[PDB]
């Protein structure tokens, strides 16, 4: 059985929500209700099978290449992504429930701000945030996820997913919406991806991708509607990126010590 | 906040690589190119009061830590990683360490897993004998006996019934026998006796080794040499013995050859697969060594002092019963070491 | 009681089957329940049966008849290939239709004495 | 395609599609690879269209296909 | 094999060694075994009830308990030959455990042969943790399968909502069909929705089968050719 | 306080307690470091595997009890730990593996890099049957002298001349070197092939990358055959 | 089943795959062969006439562009790029053909919204099925019957 992880300072979260982003009701929808909804569905889908003993991140990797396990993949991807989002927007990862700590001033580290300049042609963090807000509004028509990811070449770049698209495995990033029209450049990207997946010799037709997320923003209606409303998702993404927990985001960047 | 501290080192580390790289560049250049021109400069130069300071400070600094020194004497993890340049992509080793970082923090985000059986935990987290239930025994498959066609009718009193062509062992009796056997292991462990764990079926070694480790006992997983107990001087006399205190620490006292040839008999023998270890069981009888064994429906109960009715064919059932006995021994060992402290 | 627990055990859930494990006639549907073991349990020859399956078996799927026999072996075949036939049918996305236009057997229809 | 000659007494050949044996109906003619390959016709993969799938009382599935040929 | 005596009497044989002086030092196990005596009866025990179905073992129905005529129309006035044979053996033979659920399980998989193709894991997690409310078929912790139907049928007959087992079984079967149809659609739609957002898959199930068949059909081609050449030469004889 | 005598090794009652204890120690390391990746230079076939001999391991692994299959099992685990990526290895693994390396490392090697002399000449000696040859190879234009005499004068058989040219033909450098060959003993065939062997050994100094091609052609192998007194 | 935004449509296939004088007779062209259910995701349309072939058309541009760059490089085609592109194109076409022709259109008759925007406010995270149950009990079948084309009684 997959159970909803306990979050630090949960009593505060159930009373005052997440300050500057979500209210108490908004946080109950995104985490206490939706995470319960996902875990229960995952348990029903995977109970009695070998996947029941694997954590959601491993399930999505195991099932990423199986077309008829997409339902399990979607549930595992959403569960992993949601706790990635709830973790970097959380007031404090440490449990100051008995310490009553009210001073958590976390700021981008030097390694993060050094990789931002290197990967964005000298753009500042503030400018990159504006690009992230723009990318979310123009690339995610409906539900999806906004990620700041790091690849095998030490370069930070922006990835957006539609519905439950994993950042780890490019064949399942779901960054192109094929319901609408696509340019010849987008079709070239899809065609090149298909060729890479066909070069793999494995009988499971799987490729190697070492991309890892650094920041996760939930763009689903379960996270913003109640507090922001239809059409105000760009005000929600702005608040999330301005009140990130950088103790968690800094730890996600590999330092090498 | 303190990143600069590491940055200060990395700066020196980079500088050191630069100095070494161009030290090797000058190792290729012929001496005829550098030496004569270098000497000529000195022939055209005059030492100054300051220059002379280093003329003798370096002579001693090099006659103290290079010539008149002792060449020998009578970030710790992964200290041999060769980091890649900040412009170059991650190396294979760095990607492995980058994945290990992800595995500790992120890889387990999203959900926790409850009420799922993990095979390794039977060996490393065995329950205490008092917390064992019929359900737990049944989950491990201890109730599944042999085919009714292979029944050894001397086990009749342990049988709960037959189902799907096999005899079902009565777990209520298994639990009572298991508790009695566990108390014996704890008693012998708390008394300082030698406990030997014998099992020669494939896959049992891991359980046998850990059981011996946590009870400070002994195990045999490969083959019981016929005569190990009755012919001990011809088989085990050559191997080394040691003296230990009440805390099981080696005293270090050298042993007289008289003390190193004497038979060292186990105080208790635990047998996972008695049907294939008749030799050991008979030697235990001859040597008056109490024995514990898992007795399946085709196994003779009277050949052992303390039988435990149960499936002996499944590694889960065997490791579950072995784990319980091993933890009972551990508690006896911990109670003996505690009474010595106080 | 132990008897109540046994009736609900996972081994009890598998219906008794003595059909030949090696059948050379016409096969129209699965005849044996596929048993699956997880990778961790396979590493320890644990399948939830009475005895350990021989380590030679590398598949994670088998079909069996008897937990134990007079020959002191399990009667099993290390194959689970009827599941791939069902999943390949699902991938073809062709619904099964009645050539006689009968009522759908999976719906509780109000039938009459026609 | 399993056989290089239609099922005897039947106007349809047999194909092996997805772990099931189906009855393949050809548009008009049989592709020339049949005569060429002969009894090794099963060594090659063709594209088929699944017309309908029925269930018989014996518990079998009656799958009808159509040998889509490049045109 | 004879009931052994020397394995359970190690304490008594050892005590004779110590009392006589043949053994100077008491063994470490000696005190432990003395406090925890071995069981040494090794007897066959009678049993008077089948634990599975509660059937009484060892009860003889006397002619006084059969006053009415039988199915043949005859009264029973004397014990029959079976009643006059001693039946002590039945007290000692391990009872055959039976369950009504076994009959339904065989029926379910006879009616739905392809349910067998859904892999089942026999390795238990913890039987003691199962907290199931069989008012509904779905349960957190276990898959939806044939056993879900059987347990639902038992709950219906246990709560007396239905009287006949067949009626309860049919009611449970339809609940099972509804849940199976909702899952068949969730998987089809999930695949369709993913492809519409740019999901790419290396090998499908159909493709996997084709590749495996090619590997076998290639070895078969070689052998056929080889054995169609030995025949030609051997037949030439 | 009370003291007792107990078996030293947990494997005391096994057939070979000493071997099983050592295997257990190595198995613990392979379990603790199961994740560490292995060398990708293993494909490059790194030439390093100096493990102690079966007889040397018998001093520490049970003596007579030691079985060949037990020694094979020790090597499969020593190599697996040794083949862990050097960057990602730790001290614990190396400490355990140190005890199993041949102690020949105590001393040093007896090979000094060969180099051209003051006049750019590579000097090598070759032997065939009872004949010996000392050749001087220098960069030139294909001039050859045998004992101060022209090649066609000293060696009358064209097959002997072709044998001398073969090593230069393998490296396609027949017109790139001048050879001054001096030979003594045996007959024409022994001397010609002794010169052949010596030229091949002298050509490796000019380009050590061509040694593998010379070895594959068979010109760097000393022919052992000699006249055998009938027995 | 729809996870995010989308619509479940009750459609009616148009039996006018001829394409000759198409959309010229509001009755002869408004004829439905069979009804179907179709799912659209995000801003997808249920018509299928204005968006079919899109991938095939873009696929043929990509191959031609790659084939023209190959000619500049000077390559001798390939062993299986002409047989793989051909198969990819042959399947793309055979999967979009109609019973007679390749003009398959659909007439929207009903549409149920799956977007969480519709049902999250009143029914909550766990009440999508409750929403869909009340939606079925809230459909005015008069409006749907009105949209229904006239049956194509070619039979
Ligand atoms: Mg047994």
What does the DSSP assignment read for B124-141? Answer: HSPPPGGG--HHHHHHTT
In sequence order, what DSSP letters do the residues of F161-186 get, joined into one string?
Answer: HHHHHHHHHHTT-TTSEEEEEEEESS
Residues with CB under 5 A from ligand 1 (ion): B 296, 312-313
Instruction: Pick the residue of E191, E193, E195, E198 with the most G CBs within 10 A to test the interface with G by mutation.
Output: E193
- Smallest CA-to-CA distance from A52 within D30, B7, B111 is with B111
**C-D contacts (CB, under 8 Å):** 37
- Do chains E and C touch by CB distance (3+ pairs < 8 Å)? yes
Radius of gyration of chain G (CA): 21
Q: How far apart are CA B193 and CA F189, in angstroms?
A: 81
Phi, psi of F84 (to 5 degrees): -65, 145
Phi, psi of F36 (to 5 degrees): -55, 125
Provide the shortest C-alpha distance from residue A169 to chain B (in Å): 14
- The residue of chain F nearest to residue B97, with distances taken between CA atoms, is F88
- Do chains F and C touch by CB distance (3+ pairs < 8 Å)? no
Q: How far apart are CA E193 and CA E181, in angstroms?
A: 18
Q: What are the tokens at C45?
A: 């020859």
Q: Do A1 and B86 touch (CB under 8 A)?
A: no
Residues of F in contact with B220 (CB under 8 A): 11, 13-14
Q: How far is CA E68 from the centre of its chain?
A: 41
**A4 secondary structure, DSSP code:** P
What is the longest distance spanned by two Cα atoms in chain B? 110
Number of other residues whose CB lies within 10 A of the CB of residue F65: 17
* Method used to determine the 3D structure: cryo-EM
Strands of chain G (E only): list them.
Answer: 6-14, 31-41, 110-113, 150-151
Place of tokens 């030097």: A110
- Strands F149-150 and F144-146 come out as antiparallel
Phi, psi of B210 (to 5 degrees): -70, -40
Q: Do A53 and C40 touch (CB under 8 A)?
A: yes
- Do chains G and C touch by CB distance (3+ pairs < 8 Å)? no
Place of tokens 């009652």: F13
Length of chain B: 342
CB B145 within 8 A of CB B166: yes
Q: Do B113 and A4 touch (CB under 8 A)?
A: no
CB F158 within 8 A of CB F184: no
- Output E1-4 pairs: Cβ under 8 A, ≥24 positions apart: E1/B152, E1/B154, E1/B300, E3/B154, E3/B302, E3/E42, E4/B285, E4/B300, E4/B302, E4/B303
CB G32 within 8 A of CB G12: yes
Residues of D in contact with E109 (CB under 8 A): none
Q: Is E213 exposed, middle or buried (0-12, 13-18, 19+ CB in 10 A)?
A: middle
DSSP run (H or E) holding A145: strand A144-150
CB C50 within 8 A of CB C59: no
Q: How far is CA F188 from the centre of its chain?
A: 32
Measured in angstroms, how far is the CA atom of residue B146 from the centroid of ligand 1? 6
* Residue D15 three-state SS: strand
Q: How far is CA A181 from CA E197, G6, G32, G58, G107, in A?
A: 12, 17, 28, 11, 21
Q: How far apart are CA E87 and CA E58, in angstroms?
A: 8
- Output A66-70 pairs: Cβ under 8 A, ≥24 positions apart: A66/E201, A67/C91, A67/E191, A67/E201, A67/E204, A67/E205, A68/C87, A68/C90, A68/C91, A68/E187, A68/E191, A68/E205, A69/E187, A70/E187, A70/E190, A70/E191, A70/E193, A70/E194, A70/E199
**D9 secondary structure, DSSP code:** T
Indicate the Cα dihedral angle A166, A168, A171, A176, nearest 10°: 50
Q: How far is CA A200 from CA A189, A195, E122, E211, in A?
A: 18, 9, 35, 14
- Smallest CA-to-CA distance from B321 within B220, B190, B219, B207 is with B207
Query: What stretches of C9-105 show up as alpha helix (H) in DSSP?
Result: 10-13, 39-42, 82-91
Any CB–CB contact under 8 A between B161 and chain C?
A: yes
Number of other residues whose CB lies within 10 A of the CB of residue E95: 21
Length of chain C: 114
**A-G contacts (CB, under 8 Å):** 67
Q: How far apart are CA F222 and CA F193, in angstroms?
A: 10
* Residue G110 three-state SS: strand
Chains that touch A (3 or more CB pairs under 8 A): B, C, E, G
Q: How far apart are CA B98 and CA B100, in angstroms?
A: 5
Place of tokens 């390795």: E123
Q: Do B305 and E92 touch (CB under 8 A)?
A: no
Residues of B in contact with E52 (CB under 8 A): 161
Question: Which of E186, E196, E197 faces G1 most closely, judged by CB atoms?
Answer: E186
Q: How far apart are CA G144 and CA G150, in angstroms?
A: 13
* Residue G12 three-state SS: strand
Q: Is C90 exposed, middle or buried (0-12, 13-18, 19+ CB in 10 A)?
A: middle
Q: Do B244 and F3 touch (CB under 8 A)?
A: yes
The angstrom resolution of this structure is 2.6
- The residue of chain B nearest to residue F5, with distances taken between CA atoms, is B243
**B-F contacts (CB, under 8 Å):** 94
Q: How far apart are CA B221 and CA B44, in angstroms?
A: 82
Q: How far apart are CA B13 and CA E195, in angstroms?
A: 50
- The residue of chain G nearest to residue A188, with distances taken between CA atoms, is G62
The residues, ordered by sequence, that sit 6+ positions from F164 with a Cβ below 8 Å of its Cβ are F144, F151, F155, F181, F192, F195, F196, F199
Q: How far apart are CA D28 and CA D25, in angstroms?
A: 9
Number of other residues whose CB lies within 10 A of the CB of residue B154: 19
The angle at the Cα of B213, spanning B209 to B215, to the nearest 5 degrees, equals 120
Provide the shortest C-alpha distance from residue C88 to chain B (in Å): 30
Provide the shortest C-alpha distance from residue C55 to chain D (in Å): 29
Residues of E in contact with D16 (CB under 8 A): 213
Q: Do B161 and E95 touch (CB under 8 A)?
A: yes
CB A196 within 8 A of CB A207: yes
- Do chains A and C touch by CB distance (3+ pairs < 8 Å)? yes
Phi, psi of F136 (to 5 degrees): -115, 110
- Strands C96-97 and D47-55 come out as parallel
Report helix, strand and coil shares of chain F as percent, to nearest 5: 45, 15, 40
- Strands B166-169 and B159-163 come out as antiparallel
Residues of E in contact with D19 (CB under 8 A): 209
- The residue of chain E nearest to residue D17, with distances taken between CA atoms, is E206
Residues of A in contact with B108 (CB under 8 A): 55, 57
Residues of A in contact with G59 (CB under 8 A): 187, 191
Question: Which of C2, C50, C70 faces B314 most closely, judged by CB atoms?
Answer: C50
Question: Which of A142, A181, A191 faces G5 most closely, judged by CB atoms?
Answer: A142
**Sign of the torsion formed by the C-alpha atoms of A172, A176, A180 and A184:** negative
Measured in angstroms, how far is the CA atom of residue F115 from the centroid of ligand 1? 73
Residues of B in contact with C41 (CB under 8 A): 119
Place of tokens 């009593």: A11
In sequence order, what DSSP letters do the residues of F24-80 get, joined into one string?
Answer: HHHHHHHHHTTTSPBPSTTTTT-----BPPHHHHHHHTTGGG--HHHHHHHHHHHHH
């Amino acid at each position: 059985i997959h159970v909803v992880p306990k979050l630090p300072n949960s009593k505060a979260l159930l009373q005052n929500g997440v300050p500057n982003i979500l209210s108490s009701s908004g946080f109950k929808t995104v985490w206490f209700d939706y995470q319960r909804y996902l875990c229960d569905k995952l348990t029903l889908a995977t109970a009695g099978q070998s996947l029941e003993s694997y954590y959601p991140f491993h399930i999505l990797l195991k099932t990423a290449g199986n077309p008829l396990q997409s339902n399990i993949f979607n549930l595992a991807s959403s569960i992993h992504n949601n706790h990635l989002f709830v973790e970097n927007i959380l007031p404090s990862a440490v449990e100051h429930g008995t310490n009553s700590n009210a001073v958590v001033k976390t700021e981008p580290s030097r390694l993060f701000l050094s990789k931002i300049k290197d990967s964005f042609n000298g753009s500042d963090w503030e400018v990159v945030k504006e690009e992230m807000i723009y990318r979310a509004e123009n690339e995610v028509l409906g539900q999806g996820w906004l990620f700041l990811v790091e690849n095998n070449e030490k370069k930070l770049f922006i990835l957006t997913s539609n519905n439950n698209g994993t950042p780890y495995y490019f064949p399942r990033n779901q960054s192109f919406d094929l319901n609408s029209a696509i340019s010849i450049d987008e079709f070239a990207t899809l065609k090149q991806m298909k060729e890479l997946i066909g070069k793999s010799t494995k009988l499971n037709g799987k490729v190697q991708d070492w991309t890892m997320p650094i920041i996760c923003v939930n763009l689903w209606d379960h996270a913003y509607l109640h507090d922001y409303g239809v059409g105000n998702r760009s005000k929600y993404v702005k608040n999330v990126l301005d009140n990130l927990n950088w103790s968690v985001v800094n730890n996600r960047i590999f330092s090498g010590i | 906040p303190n990143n600069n501290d590491e940055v200060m080192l990395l700066q020196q580390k980079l500088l050191y690589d630069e100095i070494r790289s161009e030290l090797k560049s000058l190792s290729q250049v012929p001496e005829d190119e550098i030496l004569p021109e270098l000497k000529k400069s000195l022939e055209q130069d005059k030492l100054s009061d300051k220059e002379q300071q280093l003329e003798a400070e370096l002579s001693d600094f090099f006659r103290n830590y290079a010539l008149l020194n002792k060449l020998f004497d009578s970030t710790k993890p992964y200290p041999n990683l060769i980091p890649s340049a900040n412009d170059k992509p991650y190396s294979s080793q760095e990607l492995f360490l980058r994945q290990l970082n992800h595995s500790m923090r992120t890889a387990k985000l999203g959900a926790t897993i409850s009420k799922v059986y993990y095979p390794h935990k039977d060996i490393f987290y065995p329950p205490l004998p008092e917390n064992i239930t019929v359900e737990s025994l049944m989950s491990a498959g201890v109730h599944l006996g042999q085919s009714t066609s292979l029944w050894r009718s001397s086990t009749q009193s342990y049988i709960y019934g037959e189902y799907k062509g096999i005899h079902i062992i009565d777990l209520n009796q298994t639990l009572s026998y298991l508790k009695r056997a566990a108390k014996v292991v704890e008693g012998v462990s708390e008394s300082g006796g030698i406990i030997l764990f014998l099992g020669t079926r494939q896959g049992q070694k891991r359980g046998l080794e850990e059981a011996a480790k946590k009870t400070h006992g002994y195990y045999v997983s490969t083959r019981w040499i016929p005569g190990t107990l009755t012919n001990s001087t011809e088989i085990s006399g050559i191997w080394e013995k040691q003296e230990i205190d009440s805390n099981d620490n080696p005293t270090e006292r050298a042993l007289s050859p008289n003390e190193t040839s004497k038979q060292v008999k186990p105080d208790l023998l635990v047998v996972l697969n008695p049907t294939e270890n008749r030799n050991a069981l008979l030697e235990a009888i001859k040597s008056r060594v109490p024995t514990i064994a898992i007795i399946d429906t085709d196994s003779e109960p009277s050949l052992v002092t303390y039988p435990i009715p149960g499936n002996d064919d499944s590694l889960r059932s065997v490791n579950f019963l072995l784990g319980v006995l091993a933890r009972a021994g551990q508690r006896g060992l911990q109670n003996r070491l505690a009474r010595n402290n106080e | 009681t132990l008897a109540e627990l046994l009736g609900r055990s996972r081994i009890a859930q598998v219906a008794n089957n003595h059909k030949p494990l090696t059948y050379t006639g016409k096969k129209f549907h699965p005849t044996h329940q596929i048993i699956e073991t997880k990778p961790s349990t396979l590493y320890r020859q644990e399948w939830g049966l009475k005895s350990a399956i021989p380590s030679k078996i590398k598949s994670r799927y088998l079909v069996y008849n008897d937990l134990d026999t007079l020959e002191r072996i399990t009667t099993f075949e290390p194959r689970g290939g009827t599941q791939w036939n069902r999943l390949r049918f699902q991938e073809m996305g062709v619904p099964i239709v009645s050539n006689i236009g009968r009522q759908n057997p999976f719906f509780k229809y109000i039938s009459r004495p026609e | 395609i399993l056989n290089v000659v239609k099922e005897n007494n039947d106007n349809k050949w047999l194909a092996a599609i997805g772990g099931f044996v189906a009855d393949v109906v050809f548009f008009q003619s049989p592709p020339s690879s049949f005569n060429s390959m002969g009894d090794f016709i099963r060594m090659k993969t063709f594209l088929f269209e699944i017309l309908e799938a029925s269930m018989e009382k014996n518990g079998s599935v009656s799958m009808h296909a159509r040998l889509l040929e490049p045109q | 094999m004879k009931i052994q005596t020397n394995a359970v009497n190690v304490l008594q044989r050892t005590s004779a060694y110590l009392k006589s002086g043949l053994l100077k030092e008491t063994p470490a196990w000696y005190n432990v075994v003395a406090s925890i005596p071995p069981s040494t009866k090794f007897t066959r025990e009678p049993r008077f009830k089948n634990p599975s179905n509660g059937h009484i073992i060892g009860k003889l129905v006397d002619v006084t308990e059969q006053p009415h005529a039988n199915n043949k129309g005859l009264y029973k006035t004397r014990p029959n030959s079976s009643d006059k044979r001693v039946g002590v053996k039945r007290l000692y033979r391990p009872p055959k455990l039976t369950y009504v659920e076994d009959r339904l399980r065989s029926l379910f998989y006879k009616q739905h042969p392809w349910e067998l193709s859904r892999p089942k894991i026999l390795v238990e997690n913890e039987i003691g943790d199962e907290n199931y409310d069989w008012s509904h078929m779905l349960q957190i912790g276990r898959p939806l399968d044939g056993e879900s139907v059987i347990q639902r049928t038992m709950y219906l007959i246990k709560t007396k909502q239905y009287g006949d087992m067949v009626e309860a079984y049919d009611h449970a079967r339809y609940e099972f069909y509804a849940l199976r149809m909702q899952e068949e659609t969730e998987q089809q739609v999930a695949l369709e929705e993913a492809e519409m957002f740019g999901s790419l898959f290396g090998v499908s199930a159909i493709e996997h089968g084709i590749q495996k068949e090619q590997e076998v059909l290639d070895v078969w081609e070689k052998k056929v050719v080889e054995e169609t050449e030995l025949m030609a030469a051997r037949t030439s004889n | 306080l009370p003291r007792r005598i107990v078996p030293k090794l947990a494997t005391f009652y096994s057939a070979n307690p000493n071997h099983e204890d050592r295997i257990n120690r190595l198995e613990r390391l392979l379990r603790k470091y199961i994740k560490l990746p292995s060398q990708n230079n293993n494909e490059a076939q790194q030439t390093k595997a100096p493990w102690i001999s079966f007889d040397e391991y018998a001093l520490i692994g049970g003596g007579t009890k030691l079985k060949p299959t037990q020694y094979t099992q020790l090597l499969y685990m020593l190599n697996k730990l040794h083949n862990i990526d050097p960057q990602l290895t730790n001290d614990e693994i190396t400490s355990e593996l140190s005890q199993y390396y041949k102690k020949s490392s105590m001393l040093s090697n007896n090979i000094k890099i060969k180099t051209l002399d003051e006049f750019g000449r590579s000097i090598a000696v070759g032997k065939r049957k009872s004949s010996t040859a000392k050749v001087f190879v220098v960069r030139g234009t294909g001039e050859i002298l045998v004992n101060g005499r022209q090649l066609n004068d000293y060696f009358l058989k064209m097959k002997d001349r072709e044998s001398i040219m073969y090593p230069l033909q393998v490296i396609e450098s027949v017109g790139k070197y001048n050879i001054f060959a001096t030979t003594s003993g045996g007959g024409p065939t022994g001397q010609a092939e002794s010169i052949m062997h010596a030229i091949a050994k002298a050509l490796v100094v000019f380009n050590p990358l061509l040694k593998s091609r010379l070895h594959k052609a068979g010109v760097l192998t000393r022919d052992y055959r000699h006249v055998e007194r009938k027995k | 089943a729809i996870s995010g935004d989308g619509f479940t449509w009750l459609v009616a296939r148009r039996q006018l795959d001829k394409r000759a004088m198409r959309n010229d007779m509001p009755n002869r062209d408004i004829e439905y062969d069979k009804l179907f259910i179709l799912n659209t995701y995000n801003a997808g349309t249920p018509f299928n006439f204005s968006t079919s072939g899109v991938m095939n058309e873009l696929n043929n541009q990509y191959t031609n562009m790659e084939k023209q760059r190959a000619k500049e490089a000077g390559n001798l085609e390939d062993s299986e790029m002409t047989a793989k592109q051909a198969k990819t194109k042959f399947i793309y076409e055979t999967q979009q053909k109609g019973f007679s022709g390749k003009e398959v259109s659909y007439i929207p008759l009903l549409a149920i919204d799956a977007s969480p925007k519709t049902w999250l406010t009143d029914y909550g995270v766990f009440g999508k099925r409750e929403y869909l149950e009340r939606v079925w009990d809230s459909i005015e079948w008069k409006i749907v019957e009105s949209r229904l084309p006239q049956r194509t009684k070619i039979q």
